[PDB]
Symmetry: none
Subunit: 228 residues, 2 copies
Amino acid sequence: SNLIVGIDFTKSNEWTGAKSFNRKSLHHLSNTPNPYEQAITIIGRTLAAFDEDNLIPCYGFGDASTHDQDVFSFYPEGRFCNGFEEVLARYREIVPQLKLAGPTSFAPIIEMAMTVVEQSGQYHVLVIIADGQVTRSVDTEHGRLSPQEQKTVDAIVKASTLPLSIVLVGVGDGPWDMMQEFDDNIPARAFDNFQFVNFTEIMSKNKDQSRKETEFALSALMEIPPQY
Amino acid sequence: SNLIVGIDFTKSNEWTGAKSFNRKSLHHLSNTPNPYEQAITIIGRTLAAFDEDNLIPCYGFGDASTHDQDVFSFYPEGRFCNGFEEVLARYREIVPQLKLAGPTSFAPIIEMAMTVVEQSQYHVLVIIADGQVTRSVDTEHGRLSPQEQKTVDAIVKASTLPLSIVLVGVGDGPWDMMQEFDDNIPARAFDNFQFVNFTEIMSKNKDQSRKETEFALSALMEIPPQY
Ligand SMILES: [Ca+2]
Ligand SMILES: [Ca+2]
Ligand SMILES: [Ca+2]
Ligand SMILES: [Ca+2]
Ligand SMILES: [Ca+2]
Ligand SMILES: [Ca+2]
Ligand SMILES: [Ca+2]
Ligand SMILES: [Ca+2]
């Protein structure tokens, strides 16, 4: 198995840390690791074993350079991060230059993972670290969903015929209704290829750190098919 | 959720380590951990992370004091173990005092687990065992040995509670009967019994941490989708 990492850089990260991060942006850099740093770090400690070559494709999405249309690679060319040590380091280099934007769709990151799978038909797990706030639609002229939620669901459906599992690592306050829906209720799906894990909730419990980290890791891999 | 542990102390453990443990008893104490200790330790590092309060009801069964009728608590007035570090330490304290015996049945441990569930919110019962439940050729017992029949009956009755049973198999096997409890019990409300071959998983030559997670994911594989 190999890992793929996508990181949400949309503007909603500015306010989804109201309760869980003392009204600082989830991407704020300072004396203490923000929830994205914490997740990258713990993923490195607990899930990195499930990447066979320890090379990690990392992508960002939803900043002003990509909006809801594209992703960007952490490194020029098709060059990958060497371990989650470098994932974290590169995140910290990149964050100060980014203008957080939107709208929010998972279509571009899921399409990028589909391309990674075809560059390999080997099994992959895509890990998206995100605040859960995909663009919502209040409008009957739009149709049922926002175009972002429609495109995202369509990408999740298209990916479900590939050897790919998706894991949403949720950081911040939520709400988590949309992620829980992607987790449990996408009907046109070939198989259940989306798992939601509430990282911020798990890490806030009164248990030993190492037990919290293990609870996170197993919750993350809980829907990975039997055959692995 | 909450994790309950039951450990098999029947006499078959004296021979079910013939291949996997170089002809030593599976409960042999030394300066290297036996398969029960290996399993306790890995369960503590993995599955036990979910236990809400880190207090773990622990029981043994199948020694001379309980035979196929009862379990014994690791601690006097049913005091729970404080974390899996204490589960392991207490196991090591207890084993030298036990006379391994029989017959072998899972009815007592499953009945105890039901009692625990009823007094409590999801539970996982982990039974660490060599798989050798008492068999019989004699059909004056009915189709199954009294032990196997009472065990099946307990599994079925437990299936109406928020409880999943995971058999952590240690030693050589054979694993036919565990696979049957895993896959083939008719009157059951839901599939509440999973078999994991721990000795087979851990004997593979790969990264230790990946083996442990693979073990954990197998143990949790049949938890109902709700969780
Ligand atoms: Ca957003
Ligand atoms: Ca890789
Ligand atoms: Ca799911
Ligand atoms: Ca789920
Ligand atoms: Ca407990
Ligand atoms: Ca036995
Ligand atoms: Ca089963
Ligand atoms: Ca099974």
